[PDB]
C-alpha cells in the first residue's frame, strides 16, 4: 500500500499492519502520486481530500488503465471533519447521474 | 453476335484455344434499352425489356468446350453496371446465366490494392 | 457509388423500424435499475466514514512528539505491514456496465 | 424472383402456400453451407400430417426432438438482435448458453455440402445420430452450469470438437462411430 | 392458436355482450391480463443481460406469468373452453400476483376471486 | 388515415388546409379521461389573431391567462422523462415546485367527464376562474421555497382538493363557490 | 441529379463515361469551404498518364509528394468513424495526430477564396510549396510524441499557425515566404 496525505497525517499510516508512503510534496501531490502509481506494485493507491488531483486525467493516462482502484478519498486531516459526506455526494452527482 | 462467329470459326473448326473478353456490356444495355421502347414491344423487367433475356442468351451460351475438339471458347464477361445496385436489370441476368463469379467493391479499393 | 435497390430492400428495411424500436424500448428501463439502487450505497458509504475517520485520527496526532523515536516501538509490537502485491482482497465480477473488478479491504 | 422480391403474387399463390417454403441469404450460403437455408423466415405448412410414420418407423421421440431442435435455433435469435443493437456488456451463465449451443447447432448441421457425399446422403440413422450427439451435449450443459462450470471451459472440452467430426464421418461406420462417442460427452461432463 | 393479445384489439366488447351475459367479472379481468402480460415480454430479452435475479421481485413474477399464460391460456390444441373456464385459468395465474399488484380489477373483483 | 405517411396524398395535401390538429393520443386515451387533447402533439394557428376579439366580448385578462399557463405543462413535458427517475427526492426545490403544480393541471384540469352531468357541459365563466386559481397557485407555490418550505405542506393543503370540487360543482354554484375557492388559495400560503 | 440521388437515369448516364471524377457535398459547402471535395468519392486515370509530365517539368519529387498527401487524408477516413462512436480524447497520442494534421488541410486548403485573390490564383508553385510545408510536420510530429509529448500542447505551440500561412502569403511574392517559413518547422519544434 501507499496513503498518499499530508506530512504530519501521513507518518501515522506509515505504521506496521499498513504501509504508507505518503506526504505531500505538491498541492496535488503530483511529484510523489505518478511515480508511485506508475509501477502499480502497492496492493492499493490513495489520495486523500486535502490534496485530491484537480486532473484526473493527468493519472489515467500515465498509468494506462488499472484493475486496483485509486483516489479513495480519506479527509487528510482532523479538525472535527466530517463535511466529506455531502461533499463526495455532491462529487457524484456533477460528473454524472441527475443533475440538480 | 458478329464477334462471337468469328470465335466459332477459329476455336472449333481450325482447333485453337481462343480466349474471347467482352467489355462494356452496359454500353450494350444501352443499345438494347432503344430498340426496347422505340419499337412495339412494351417493357416487361422493371423498365427495360423482355425479349432481354433472349438478348443476353444468345451471347452468352455461344462459348463452352466441346467434347470432340480441342479447342474451345473461353468467354469473360466485364460488367460495368450502373452504381452497386443488385436489383439493376445487367447483374440480374447475369448472376443467374453464369456459374461462379467474381465481384470488385470499394472496401478493397480505398486501400490501393489493385 | 453505392445506392440502396427498391425490390430486394424493402422487406429488410420495414422490419428494420419493428426491430428497432422494440429492442431500445426495453435497453431504456435496462440501466434506470442499477441507478435507483447506486444512491443508496453512495449515501450509506459515508456513515461508517465520519464516525471511524475521527477515531482513527484521535490517537494518531496524538502520538506525534511522542513518537518520532516511539515509532520504532509501536511498529514491532504490532503485526507486520501489509503486503504490497495484492494485500487486499480483490474479486472479480461480471456485471452490465462492463466487467468491473471490485474488491474490499 | 426477378426483381429481388420475396413478396410478389406467384410466390404467394403457389410457392409458399405449399408444404414447405424456404429463402437464402447470399453471404449465408458463401460460409460453407451449400445449399443455405433460412432458420427463421422459413416454415412449413405440412408438419401435422408427417408426424404419423415418423412415429412408428423412426420412433416415438422423432417428431418431439425434431420440434425441440427447431426452438432452441429459433430462441437464440432472441439474443441475436441485442448483440447487434448495442451488445452484451455482461456476459452470464444462462447469456452465452443458448448463444454457443446454436453456434455449434448451424456450424455442423446447416453446414452441409451437395458435392461431398460424406456431408450428405439419404440415410435415416445419420439424421437420427447427428441429432442425438447434440441433445446429449446440450442436456449436461444446463446442469454444468448450475454446479459451476464456466461456460469458457465448456467450448474447450474436445468433444465439441467430436460433434464437429461427425459431419465428415464414412456412412457405414457411423453406427459404431456413435456409440463410442455418446459416452464421452456424458463421462466429459459430469467429472468435470 | 397463434394468436398474439397485443397488436389485436376488439372496437367493440361493450356494444356486443354486457353484464350478468358473459359474468360481470370479465370486463375489467380483461384489463387485467392485457398489462400482466405485455410487461413480461420485454424482461425476456433481460433474463440474461442482467438477470432477473438483480430485478425486483414484482418483475420477476412477471416473468414466469407470461410463459404459463402461452402454455395454459393462448394453447389448449382442439380441446373446448367456456367463459367461465377461461375465467377460471386467469384467477389462478393471478393468484400468483399480490392483491398490490391487482390493481387493474375492482375491489368487488379482488374480493370474488384472488 | 390507418396509419397516415407524411409522403401519402391524403395527409400532406389535408395538412396545409386547415389550421388545427387538435391530436389525441394513444398513451392519453387509455387513462380514461376526455380530454384527452395531447398538447405537445397540438397546435392551432388561429390564436394569435383570436386574442384581441377574446378579451373585447369576453373577459379581460382571459387570453392574459390562456397563453401563460401552457408553460407549466411544456416545462414538464421534457422533465419527467429519465431526469425524474423515482420522483425527485436527490433534486431541488427548483423543480420539485414544477410536479407539485403539475400534479393539480393534470388530475384536476385536464380531467373531465362526459358521463357525469357536473361537468360534461362547460361554459366561459367556469373554466376562466378554474384557470385563473391554478396561476396563481405557481405564483404562492414558487414564492413557497424562497420562504423555506417544502412540498409536504404543500401535499396536505386542501386547496388541492377544492380544485378538484369545482369542477364536482356546475356553473349554476359556480359564483358562490368560486369565492370561496379563490380565497382560500391566498390564506393558504399566508399559513406557510 | 434532380432528384438528389445518383440513381437518376440524367446522372447514370454521364458516369457511363471515364477519366477523371469529382464529388462536391452539400456538408462540406455550407463552411464555405469551395471546392468541396470528397477523397473517398473520386478517382482518377490521369494520375499516371501524368506522371512523365510532372517528373520532366514540374518537379522529380512531385509524383512523390503527391503520394505523400493521399496517406494522410486515407488514414482520416477510417479514423473519422472511430471518432464519432467515441471521442479521440478517449483514444492515444498518435491517433488524434493525423486527425489534426488533418484541419490544416481543410483550414487552410480547402479554402481557396473566390473573394480573395491570393487564393483565387494557385500554380504549381504554390502546389508543391506548401505540400512540403505540411510533409515536415507530419515526419516531425510522429517521433516527437514518441518522446511523450501531447498533440494537446502542440495546438498551443507555434507550429500549427505557422503551416497556415497558405492564404495570408503572395503567389508573385510567395518563394520570399516558401523557404523561410519552412526551415522553423525541422527547427524550432524539436528544440521544443
Known sequence: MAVIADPETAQGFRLAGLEGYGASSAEEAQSL??????????????????????????????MRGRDLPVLLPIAGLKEAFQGHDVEGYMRELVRKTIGF | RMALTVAEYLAFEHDYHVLVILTDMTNYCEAL??????????????????????????????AGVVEGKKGSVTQIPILSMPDDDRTHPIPDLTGYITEGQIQLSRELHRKGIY | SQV????????????????????????????????????????????????????????????????????????????????????????????????????KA | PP????????????????????????????????????????????????????????????????????????????????????????????????????????????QQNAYHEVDAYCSMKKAYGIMKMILAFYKEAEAAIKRGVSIDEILQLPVLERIGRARYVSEEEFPAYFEEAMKEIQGAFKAL | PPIDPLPSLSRLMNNGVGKGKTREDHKQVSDQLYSAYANGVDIRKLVAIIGEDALTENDRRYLQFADAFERFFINQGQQNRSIEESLQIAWALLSMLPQGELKRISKDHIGKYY
Open chain 2, 33 to 62: 434499352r432503344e430498340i426496347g421502347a422505340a419499337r412495339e414491344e412494351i417493357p416487361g423487367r422493371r423498365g427495360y425489356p423482355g425479349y432481354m433475356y433472349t438478348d443476353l442468351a444468345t451471347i452468352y451460351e455461344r
Open chain 3, 4 to 103: 440502396s435497390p427498391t425490390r430486394m430492400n424493402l422487406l429488410q428495411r420495414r422490419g428494420q423500424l419493428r426491430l428497432a424500436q422494440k429492442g431500445v424500448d426495453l435497453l431504456k428501463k435496462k440501466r434506470d435499475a442499477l441507478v435507483a439502487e447506486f444512491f443508496g450505497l453512495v449515501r450509506e458509504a459515508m456513515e461508517a466514514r465520519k464516525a471511524l475517520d475521527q477515531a482513527a485520527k484521535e490517537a494518531y496526532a496524538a502520538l506525534l512528539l511522542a513518537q518520532a523515536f516511539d515509532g520504532p516501538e509501536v511498529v514491532a509490537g504490532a503485526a507486520l505491514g501489509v503486503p504490497p502485491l495484492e494485500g487486499v482482497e480483490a474479486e472479480v465480477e461480471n456485471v452490465w456496465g462492463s466487467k468491473v473488478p471490485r474488491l
Open chain 1, 33 to 62: 502520486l505518478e511515480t508511485l502509481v506508475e509501477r502499480g506494485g502497492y496492493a492499493l493507491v490513495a489520495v486523500d481530500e486535502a490534496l485530491l488531483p484537480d486532473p484526473e486525467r493527468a493519472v489515467e493516462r500515465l
Open chain 4, 3 to 110: 426483381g429481388g422480391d420475396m413478396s410478389e403474387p406467384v410466390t404467394q399463390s403457389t410457392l409458399r402456400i405449399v408444404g414447405a417454403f424456404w429463402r437464402l441469404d447470399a453471404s449465408l450460403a458463401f460460409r460453407r453451407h451449400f445449399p443455405a437455408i433460412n432458420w427463421n423466415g422459413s416454415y412449413s405448412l405440412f408438419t401435422s400430417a408427417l408426424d404419423p410414420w415418423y412415429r412408428e418407423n423412426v420412433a416415438e421421440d422423432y417428431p418431439e426432438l425434431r420440434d425441440a431442435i427447431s426452438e432452441l435455433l429459433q430462441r437464440e435469435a432472441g439474443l441475436q438482435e441485442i448483440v447487434q443493437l448495442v451488445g452484451p456488456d455482461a456476459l452470464q451463465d444462462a447469456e452465452r448458453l443458448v448463444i454457443e449451443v446454436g453456434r455449434i447447432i448451424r456450424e455442423d448441421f446447416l
